[PDB]
């Protein structure tokens, strides 16, 4: 089906202790493949997935260049926002950037993104039509004016719809065996008594990919979304994911409940019973 | 994103003398600066690029020296010119990577001719040739010709000046000077130019035509021991008035 | 090899359109191409730019035909004008490995000579006398159309300048002309330009 590429960078100032630290990572779907860390020795864009190690020195040279150029301007950007907001140089601040494109099953452009957040909230972001900016506030509007004058919008539009899309296609191929794999969740129930009168039923899903999954509980074929405990999906640490849903049950009524699991790699929704 | 200006535009200097080209930009702050070189009149080689005040960098090592003492002040220099330093040097500026998509814009450029033997330097002689009556009768137009002769080195600027105002309409000047003796390796040069006006214009005795040739040569400070007058930078003119007959 | 302009020189009739070719070599996936025009004054002026992700650039009479796969980025100027005559330069722009600046590399340039359309030829050779010295004179071959070509002379102390066009703008009038001069006593306007092929109906005024 659809796929996505993403770059996330994070710049955090650390006043009186040096230059801001810049960390950037890149993803294809739910898999990281590169990183850059301004405090690292290599001072180059590094590989974080085997299927990208096959790009030659020119890739690394050009990519390093781009990420370095970005890291230096976001360094300067922190300073500009600081002045824009007239904030104290004593405080630490954060600038985050997200960039990338979505493509469809047919490898064709779907959506493009180019957004900044300052101190964890929206600053400026490119709209769905890739033609105009959404400026969160008065300061961002100064920037929206700079970017308008510099034609950043139309420039990035062309890149998203072009360079980014094509690169995504190349990656999906280079890493076909990994990126286009599908991992059904390996499931199972567990039973945990809390009292003589109650017990926890927990439904597990493990080692699945991508991370998109739906886990639901049903008391005799009926939703329990309010009484179900659901943990945020989580990395197994090996490119797969885990998740669990749970309901507290009055003793005796166990067999009343049912666990339902939907995942891309499951031909049909699974149902589990205690 | 306004103005860039470099100076001087034309330079004639002996080997060993110091070199100082300066450049300025206006209307923009913290721009990227560059020194480019054009050998012959073909390829441009990037000599120096400056990312910001105080910062100078080059891709391949250079004998010429560059500096940027102020945001909008750029310099190309040397403490002793080598005859190999001859060439056309262009200053240029651009927006910074962060400020936008860099598009390099050039200043006018500077012709630097380092000359080995200053005894080879000759100011031009200028002469104006009045229109023929045959032309006037046959076409009702009148062509003057200007002739600059025996000058060295290459770079002079020939202009026409009619009634005190420079003129461009009706004028054509040879793309470049020809060698008077193509054999010789320091041939003095010659240059010709035409100014065409209507017969009635030329026939007005209130009309003053002047041909001017700016010449670049030695300075007042350059030493000179030869008999003939010192071939300093100067202007040579020749003129004619309209006439009816 | 980084930027390649195979055409050293190109000529084309005024009012017509010309195409200046450019090929380049880059291992970058993102880059820009720039076209500059160098005036006879040697002034380098910017014309148009083309990005590796953009449609075919177009700006006034200038247009770029971006053929990305071939890495071909030829410039085309239509409705030629006499002042279009200049040297045109193709340049490649790549973000440096340092991220610090854009490295721009220039091709060797192509001289465009736009050819005047002389609609009212009146080829003639006149003799002009020095404003200060009657005896000193010069020969002016003029009013020939662009089909005529001016050759040097068999003699080495007979000087001949190549043809150049002048524009009496207000009269919408153009004219070609070459100049010739000599100290040779046997030098005369009658025989000055006869090492060139000149229109048989060339006017040689008396005296």
């Amino acid at each position: 089906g659809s796929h996505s590429m993403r770059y996330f960078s994070t710049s955090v100032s650390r006043p009186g202790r040096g230059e801001p630290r810049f960390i950037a990572v890149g993803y294809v779907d739910d898999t990281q493949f590169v990183r850059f860390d301004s405090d690292a020795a290599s001072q180059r864009m590094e590989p974080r997935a085997p299927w990208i190690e096959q790009e030659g020195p020119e890739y690394w040279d050009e990519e390093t260049g781009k990420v370095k150029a970005h890291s230096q301007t976001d360094r300067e950007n922190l300073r500009i926002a600081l002045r824009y907001y007239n904030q104290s140089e004593a405080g630490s601040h954060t600038l985050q950037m997200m960039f990338g494109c979505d493509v469809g099953s047919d490898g064709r452009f779907l959506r493009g993104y180019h957004q900044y957040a300052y101190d964890g909230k929206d600053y400026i972001a490119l709209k769905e039509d890739l033609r105009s900016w959404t400026a969160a506030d008065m300061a961002a509007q100064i920037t929206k004016r700079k970017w308008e004058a510099a034609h950043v919008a139309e420039q990035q539009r062309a890149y998203l719809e072009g360079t980014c899309v094509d690169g995504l296609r190349r990656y999906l191929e280079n890493g076909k065996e990994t990126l286009q794999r599908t991992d059904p969740p390996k499931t199972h129930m567990t039973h945990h008594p809390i009292s003589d009168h109650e017990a926890t039923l927990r439904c597990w899903a493990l080692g699945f990919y991508p991370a998109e999954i739906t886990l639901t509980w049903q008391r005799d074929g009926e939703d329990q979304t309010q009484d179900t405990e659901l943990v945020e999906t989580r990395p197994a640490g090996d490119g797969t994911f885990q998740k669990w849903a749970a309901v507290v049950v009055p003793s005796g009524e166990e067999q009343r409940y049912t666990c339902h699991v939907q995942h891309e790699g499951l031909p049909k929704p699974l149902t589990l019973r205690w | 994103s306004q103005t860039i200006h470099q100076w001087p535009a034309t330079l004639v200097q002996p080997v060993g003398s110091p070199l100082s080209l300066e450049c300025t930009v206006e209307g923009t702050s913290n721009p990227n600066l560059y020194w480019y070189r054009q050998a012959a009149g073909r390829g441009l080689q990037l000599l120096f690029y400056s990312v910001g005040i105080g910062q100078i960098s080059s891709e391949v090592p250079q004998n010429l020296s560059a500096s940027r003492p102020q945001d909008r002040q750029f310099i190309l220099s040397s403490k002793k010119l080598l005859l190999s330093d001859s060439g056309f040097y262009l200053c240029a500026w651009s927006v910074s990577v962060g400020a936008g998509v860099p598009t390099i814009y050039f200043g006018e450029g500077s012709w630097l001719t380092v000359v080995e033997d200053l005894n080879k330097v000759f100011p031009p002689e200028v002469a104006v040739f009045e229109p023929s009556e045959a032309e006037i009768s046959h076409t009702q137009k009148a062509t003057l010709v200007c002739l600059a002769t025996g000058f060295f080195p290459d770079h002079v600027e020939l202009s026409w000046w009619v009634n005190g105002k420079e003129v461009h309409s009706g004028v054509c000047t040879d793309p470049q000077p020809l060698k008077e003796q193509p054999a010789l390796n320091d041939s003095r040069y010659a240059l010709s130019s035409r100014l065409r006006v209507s017969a009635t214009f030329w026939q007005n005795p209130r009309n003053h035509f002047r041909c001017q040739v700016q010449f670049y040569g030695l300075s007042e400070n350059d030493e000179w021991t030869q008999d003939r007058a010192k071939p300093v930078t100067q202007i040579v003119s020749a003129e004619a008035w309209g006439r009816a007959d | 090899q980084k930027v390649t302009q195979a055409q050293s020189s190109v000529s084309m009739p005024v009012r017509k359109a010309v195409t200046l070719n450019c090929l380049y070599e880059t291992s970058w996936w993102s880059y820009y191409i720039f076209w500059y025009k160098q005036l006879p004054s040697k002034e380098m002026i910017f014309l148009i730019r083309q990005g590796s992700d953009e449609q075919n650039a177009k700006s006034g009479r200038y247009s770029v035909n971006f053929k990305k796969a071939a890495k071909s980025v030829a410039l085309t100027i239509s409705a030629l004008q006499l002042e279009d005559s200049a040297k045109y330069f193709c340049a490649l722009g790549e973000l440096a490995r340092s991220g610090g600046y854009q490295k721009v590399t220039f091709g060797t340039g192509t001289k465009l000579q736009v050819i005047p359309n002389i609609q009212n030829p009146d080829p003639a050779v006149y003799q002009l006398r020095d404003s200060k010295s009657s005896d000193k004179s010069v020969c002016l071959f003029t009013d020939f159309d662009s089909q005529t070509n001016v050759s040097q002379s068999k003699d080495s102390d007979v000087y001949i300048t190549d043809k150049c066009v002048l524009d009496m703008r207000s009269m919408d009038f153009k004219s070609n002309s070459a100049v010739a001069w000599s100290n040779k006593s046997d030098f005369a306007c009658a025989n000055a330009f006869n090492n060139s092929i000149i229109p048989e109906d060339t006017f040689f005024p008396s005296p």
Partner: peptide, 10 residues
């Protein structure tokens, strides 16, 4: 391919 950040200055 990491974004080309020309003009991204605030």
């Amino acid at each position: 391919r990491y974004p080309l950040t020309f003009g991204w200055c605030f």
